[PDB]
From a paper:
Peptides starting at g (g-register) form a parallel 6-helix barrel in solution and in an X-ray crystal structure, whereas the b- and c-register peptides form an antiparallel complex. AUC showed that both CC-Hex2-AB-3-b and -g assemble into monodisperse hexamers. Concentration-dependent CD experiments confirmed A3:B3 stoichiometry, and both bound DPH with low μM affinities. CC-Hex2-AB-3-g showed reduced fluorescence when the substituted amino acids were positioned at the same terminus (N- + N-), suggesting an assembly with a parallel helix orientation. The 1.9 Å resolution structure revealed a parallel heterohexameric coiled-coil barrel with alternating A and B chains, which is completely consistent with the solution-phase data. Indeed, these were near-superposable with the X-ray crystal structure of CC-Hex2-AB-3-g (Cα-RMSD = 0.52 Å). Moreover, at 5.6 Å, the Z-shift for the -g peptide is a whole α-helical turn (5.4 Å). Reasoning that larger Z-shifts lead to larger helical overhangs and less helix–helix contacts in the assembled CCs, it stands to reason that the antiparallel arrangement for the g-register peptide would be the least stable of these and less stable than the observed parallel structure. One of these, CC-Hex2-AB-3-g, has all-parallel helices, as is confirmed by solution-phase spectroscopic data and an X-ray peptide crystal structure. Similarly, while CC-Hex2-AB-3-g forms a parallel A3B3 αHB, the antiparallel tetramer, ap-CC-Tet, also has a g-register but with bar-magnet charge patterning to drive the antiparallel state.
α-Helical barrels (αHBs) are a subset of CCs in which five or more α-helices assemble to generate central solvent-accessible channels along the superhelical axis. Here, we target new assemblies, namely, A3B3 heterohexamer α-helical barrels. These designs are based on pairs of sequences with three heptad repeats (abcdefg), programmed with a = Leu, d = Ile, e = Ala, and g = Ser, and b = c = Glu to make the acidic (A) chains and b = c = Lys in the basic (B) chains. Thus, we set out to design a heterohexameric, A3B3-type αHB, for which the individual helices were unfolded in solution and coassembled when mixed.
Numbering used by the authors:
A (entry chain F), C (entry chain A), D (entry chain C), F (entry chain B), G (entry chain H), I (entry chain I), ...: 1 to 23
B (entry chain D), E (entry chain E), H (entry chain J), J (entry chain G), L (entry chain L): 1 to 22
Write the structure that this text describes.
């Protein structure tokens, strides 16, 4: 389902922004 | 379910972006 | 509810990105 | 309700990111 | 509808972030 | 419909943000 | 949008069930 | 918006069905 | 997608229930 | 939230229809 | 996903009510 | 969450309505 795909993408986005914010 | 996971990730995204903005 | 939390988080994200864009 | 608020915030986010991309 | 507006905004967001990444 | 478009756009956003975080 | 159409149908469904219950 | 209207209509539907079931 | 299918089914249900109520 | 209200009403509707069917 | 399940159930509900209305 | 509860309730409603139709 789409909501499952959206949740997965947002987990990746959150991780990327965690790396950016710490850098 | 998925909606709660979405909400959780967006809360984390908001904290990271507030840190970046500061 | 989840939709209210999502809306609140996006309001915060918009606020932060406005600050970032403004120099 | 929340869905309309989500739409409004994402519109603001889109404008801020266009500003950042242009700046 | 709101979902249509959300989808359109996310297309703009994707386009801007592609430009930023490049 | 719209939810699938949203998922597709978020996959693209996730890719661009991973690229940004990696430099 | 679909959500608007769904709300319209549920208003019709609600009225039909009112007629059944009160009939 | 639409989700709140859907909820209101479903509350009415539940009330009518409670009358029928009762 | 699924939301459009839901709207289509609810329009059908509304018509069927109106016929039942008129009977 | 709207979804919580919708879920609550649908639980009521399902119970009423169980009573009707039984 | 849940939305796919909801659509499937409403397809079944529509068929059941159509059969009742036609009878 | 709520969407899964909505799905479960509609599955129950569908079984009950099929029983009534039968």
């Amino acid at each position: 389902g789409s909501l499952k795909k959206i949740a997965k993408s947002l987990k990746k986005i959150a991780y990327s922004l965690k790396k950016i914010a710490q850098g | 379910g998925s909606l709660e996971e979405i909400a959780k990730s967006l809360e984390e995204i908001a904290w990271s972006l507030e840190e970046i903005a500061q």
